Amino acid sequence: LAASLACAL
């Protein structure tokens, strides 16, 4: 989940 937020942004 944490990585998905950073990736998206």
Alpha carbons 4 and 2: distance in angstroms, whole number = 5
* Structure determined via: X-ray
Tell me the residue type at 1: L
Ramachandran assignment for 6, one of left (phi > 0), alpha (psi -120 to 50 degrees), beta (any other): alpha
Tell me the residue type at 7: C
Question: What resolution (Å)?
Answer: 0.9
